[PDB]
Request: fold
Amino acid sequence: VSLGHRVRKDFRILHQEVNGSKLVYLDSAATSQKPAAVLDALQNYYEFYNSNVHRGIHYLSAKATDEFELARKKVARFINASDSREIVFTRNATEAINLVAYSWGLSNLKPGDEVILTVAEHHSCIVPWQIVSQKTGAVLKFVTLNEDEVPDINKLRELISPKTKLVAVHHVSNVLASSLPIEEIVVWAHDVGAKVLVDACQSVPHMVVDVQKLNADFLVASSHKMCGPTGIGFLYGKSDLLHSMPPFLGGGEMISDVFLDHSTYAEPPSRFEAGTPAIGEAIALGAAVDYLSGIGMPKIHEYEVEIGKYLYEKLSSLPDVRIYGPRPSESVHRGALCSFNVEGLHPTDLATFLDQQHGVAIRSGHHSAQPLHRYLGVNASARASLYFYNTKDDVDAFIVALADTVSFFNSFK
Amino acid sequence: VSLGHRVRKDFRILHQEVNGSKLVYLDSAATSQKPAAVLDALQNYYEFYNSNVHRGIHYLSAKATDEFELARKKVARFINASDSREIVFTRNATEAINLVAYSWGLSNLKPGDEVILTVAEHHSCIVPWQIVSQKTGAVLKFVTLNEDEVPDINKLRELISPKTKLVAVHHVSNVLASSLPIEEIVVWAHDVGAKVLVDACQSVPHMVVDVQKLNADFLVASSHKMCGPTGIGFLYGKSDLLHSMPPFLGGGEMISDVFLDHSTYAEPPSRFEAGTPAIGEAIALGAAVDYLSGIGMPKIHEYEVEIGKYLYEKLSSLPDVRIYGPRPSESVHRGALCSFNVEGLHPTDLATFLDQQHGVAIRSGHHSAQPLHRYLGVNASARASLYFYNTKDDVDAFIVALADTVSFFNSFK
Reply:
């Protein structure tokens, strides 16, 4: 029994019919589905010990606070943070990136300072640093792709100079499925005195992530892509860096004392957590971490390797299909997703027909990476993305359905 | 059978023993408990149609998107917004206040501009404006209390001058249980060109709220206090005002087009909703709105006035008890909470004993209203706070338990 066929039972949502067909869900890169264990944890919180956290004294509040802070610890060890106080809870990675931009960026960046991105960056890792640029006078340096449709590592290294103060790049690309050598990027950046923000949204759900091994200064991720609930995500930041940073959001809970004239602030991470947090959601994210850890991130990543290659191979075997990004090898690792287009056909037509006639769920669009599509020469692409609850059977059904969809639209010549 | 005894069945969490005693929950001002209907809607989302929202072609996405946006309309209807596009989803009211402070505040407040608050303001409606003041040179004008321990409405009106640009005050106080004449205050502020932000966290869950009648410019509230999940809250704002406002958080979903050099932004409310939102939590908040509406907010308000009055009377019948805020009368109405202290005893001792020996859950501290307690001459107070699932029997148990607690600690003096 493959991993997918073993865990499929845990995910109630996959066991239904859509538009007359068995659902085939291949959009996990937009968001993941949740196992019973996570939903149980969420229900058990609300039904048995919901109360506001910290300084609540009474039994339910003490239990709520315990589990809440315990979930912070679970996330901390998942990414191997040295200290749980280096984990700050946000709504999503987007907010987490904004926290760094507002609190650290507006506080450390001067006119002339350089921030390095790639053209394959997600919008949440472009727009905040655009606004920081417009406020501070800092300049954005973009790393174009090479012949293998991945960010050019020597071009990136060339861009690292004493003017560089920040490198904000993806660990894994949500479109190209390519990875960056973060650990060595961090060394080159640190040699110059620059900080590295890692957009780890597509790596944390799918492979082992070690922030100490990476030595990254900031790392961001979203719960909803890693079998956890919507409405929570997290920011990792080195303790020393967080202690240096001013508050982002202000108000209740993040303060030490409040006077009419001024207020004093708590230390991280409470400094950056203003008002009542996503308590039940944090606790269920903890459960998602327990669930993923129970399977084993090595087991998951190795499985995604096999089904990802299988998806790449079968998709690429169709004529007129172009898959963006690198070709799989033992030197080039790919995430378990393919962004593609079919000659003469619009990806929205593909996605629509796949869903309506075959119950297959993919997405069409720029996938929040419009500049990348521009550099590739298109406005949109189709994307099939897997998680460990997908199977080879899912890929086969998708390929059959896609071949039928292509045949349909081409029949009109 | 009273409303409380009618609906208690809906709330699983109330039916348990803590510390050997039947639970008596009197901490709803800190957070509320959730009816089965809300939890079911949350579970139903995750088990059956979880998918990312907007521009998603496939069946599950279309359904999630429809329910997500329907939930936005349910919230707009609940507070009688004229347009659902005037509702912006946040993590909590604190964030919503921060949105206004950052987006509207920093781009409209100049050195010398005045912001009017009261000394009874919640920390989330104090600290963001302190920070804005520090950044723009604006100044805060605080309204003190009168002999009835409510904000001096005379001193408030007199503070209104051509220098005031914003009045940011509570609708109902989370400590005093008093209310402010918001509708009138809006008229006075608008006559000098000032905006009004209503902190409606203690009004939205407990009574009919009509933003068009109030004619408020901004209004904020948190889901977790109104039978909804943690992790979501909202900002209401007039469409013209929201349209004039620059983005707060930047990234995916809030954009129109993203280029390497700059980005354009969507219109409200998408403009202010960056990255994947708390999709499931928003849907559940809509279910909470459906639930509260099914009971009836006038019926809820009527019931809280009765049990709130009952609580005040019983508590004030105990010797050496002082309740902060105004006395209940035919002209002056209190919310269903009492913040208090007992002569010679610390409120933390009261709360701890009540929980451990009697299973009674209340709160001790400054309840994120520190300048208010300072003003009143104390560092902290005890607070018992009710919702419509509380009964007179709960109040009787509390008073019995409190009398015993007072007896215990005074037995050593």
